């Protein structure tokens, strides 16, 4: 006795299989999943006829397809993605003034903040998996995108998280190749040192939330023992992320794209997302509060950019 089923690594390229109904999926395919559920130790059932099963790559065809879809060789990736998916399919993805959010569940506030952010910055994902899941997420069906973010960032459902770290890992999988940052450090004694950063390093900064302050100059130690001034010479990127340890900060309407608010301490906290539209919006999972002003403990601010050149001589 046998049924036909489809095996896949990507849910786009399906491989017809004839499965011996007296053996477990595991003995026949290796590790096997059905709509996120692990069926490795399970024997084929009648109503499995015609259904699609994910399998761990166990041959050169599945290996190539897996790499082309996900851009990773981690053999733990599929199981981690499938484990997260069982939870993320149970979350609720409300539309909050045209953006997909997540209702609070399983310590997901950092994830909802990242998801809202990704819908507001210009980013091209390289892995087809992230490109496809992103478009579904933007339409309200974000479960696969959320499970992929957890898999790529090596996070488990319910684990506490850092938006800055989540954005950073996801940016490794974005086409930021042509993003460029030039910095100048001026010591009155030693002279001027210019540095060029590219890709992810060109769009991140940890130390100040203010894009304007980065342009104007920040005081840093010079190895001579004096204070030097560091300033942005040139920025070529569609956005910048400015981060700092969480601190009371005033967000002014029209002067930024969106921001992460972190309330709590280094053991436990809660993120809210602030975005600048016709007024200031504070999105807390499914809840939306509109205000003319906002002050709170901010840790990330995103600004839109194309090309900036300093006038500092």
């Amino acid at each position: 006795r046998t049924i036909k089923v489809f095996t896949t690594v990507d849910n786009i390229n399906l491989h017809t299989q004839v499965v011996d109904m007296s053996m477990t999926y595991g003995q026949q395919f290796g590790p096997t999943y059905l709509d996120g559920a692990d069926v490795t130790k399970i024997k084929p059932h009648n109503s499995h006829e015609g259904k699609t099963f994910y399998v761990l790559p166990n041959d050169d065809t599945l290996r190539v397809e897996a790499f082309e879809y996900y851009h990773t060789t981690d053999p733990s990736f599929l199981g981690r993605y499938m484990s997260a998916l069982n939870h993320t399919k149970k979350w609720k993805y409300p539309q909050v003034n045209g953006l997909t959010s997540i209702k609070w569940a399983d310590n997901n506030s950092y994830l909802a903040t990242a998801l809202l952010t990704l819908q507001q910055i210009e980013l091209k994902f390289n892995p087809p998996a992230l490109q496809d899941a992103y478009y579904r997420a933007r339409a309200g069906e974000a479960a696969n995108f959320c499970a992929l973010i957890l898999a790529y960032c090596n996070k488990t459902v319910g684990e506490l998280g850092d938006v800055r770290e989540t954005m950073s890992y996801l940016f490794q999988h974005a086409n930021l190749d042509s993003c460029k940052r030039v910095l100048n450090v001026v010591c009155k004694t030693c002279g001027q040192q210019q540095t060029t950063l590219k890709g992810v390093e060109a769009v991140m900064y940890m130390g100040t939330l203010s894009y304007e302050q980065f342009k104007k100059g920040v005081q840093i130690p010079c190895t001579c023992g004096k204070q030097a001034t560091k300033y942005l010479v040139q920025q070529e990127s569609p956005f910048v992320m400015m981060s700092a340890p969480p601190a009371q900060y005033e967000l002014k309407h029209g002067t930024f794209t969106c921001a992460s608010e972190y309330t709590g301490n280094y053991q436990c906290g809660h993120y809210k997302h602030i975005t600048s539209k016709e007024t200031l919006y504070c999105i807390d999972g499914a809840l939306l509060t509109k205000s003319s002003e906002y002050k709170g403990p901010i840790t990330d601010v995103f600004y839109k950019e194309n090309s900036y050149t300093t006038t500092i001589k």
Binding site: L160, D162, Y205, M206, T208, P221, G269, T299
Partner: protein
Amino acid sequence: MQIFVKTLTGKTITLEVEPSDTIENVKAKIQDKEGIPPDQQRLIFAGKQLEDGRTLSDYNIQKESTLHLVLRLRGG
């Protein structure tokens, strides 16, 4: 060679290091001196996040250079 590491309180820490030391190596030296677990630590050089499995030489960090130690957030 010595580097300096500024903590969130403004405490400055001296470490003994070598240009080929990985970031993980520097995190152990801070775990030794302050007892902070390496997994909580994030090392910053003049705004740039230093990543595990790159060296001080990779980032052109030289003697008398100052790093910043920040900690991962725990949002839920």
